[PDB]
Symmetry: C2
Subunit: 90 residues, 2 copies
Amino acid sequence: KRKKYTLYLHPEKAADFQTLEAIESVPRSERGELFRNAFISGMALHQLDPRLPVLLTAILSEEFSADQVVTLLSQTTGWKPSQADIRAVL
Amino acid sequence: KRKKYTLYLHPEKAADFQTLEAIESVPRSERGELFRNAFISGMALHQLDPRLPVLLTAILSEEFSADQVVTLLSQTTGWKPSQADIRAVL
């Protein structure tokens, strides 16, 4: 068994175009597994809050960073630091 | 140039199954735009660190949380809160 999914990107938009470059630097053999994981985590973000996947898409750029994902995660989810290095005791 | 991508999920697995349900509760009409966003942001995560999209897929459960994403993010990127601690201390 295995469900098949089809989707389309628009190479004119910067995010789409940038995604296309990231994919082509991944050997075809390894892509089916890449797509699955990208799609699952993408949909995971969606389950966290439906705006997230469209937000990450919209913000995507060469400056993309983990930070952008966290603050974006804060704004959408209310997520706030719960733990932190203990050295950071001021 | 509307590029097209084909990917496969595996209902037999928890993560894939949990993803199917998410898709299901989204009207067919909207799924096309939902798939692109989930895909692009999934690949955005890939660009941050290739292990990320497979770490999220792997951890995926009904307890998925922003907090889990931030964690995998730091364990995989080096991201850490900042003076954003002084805040939480309130």
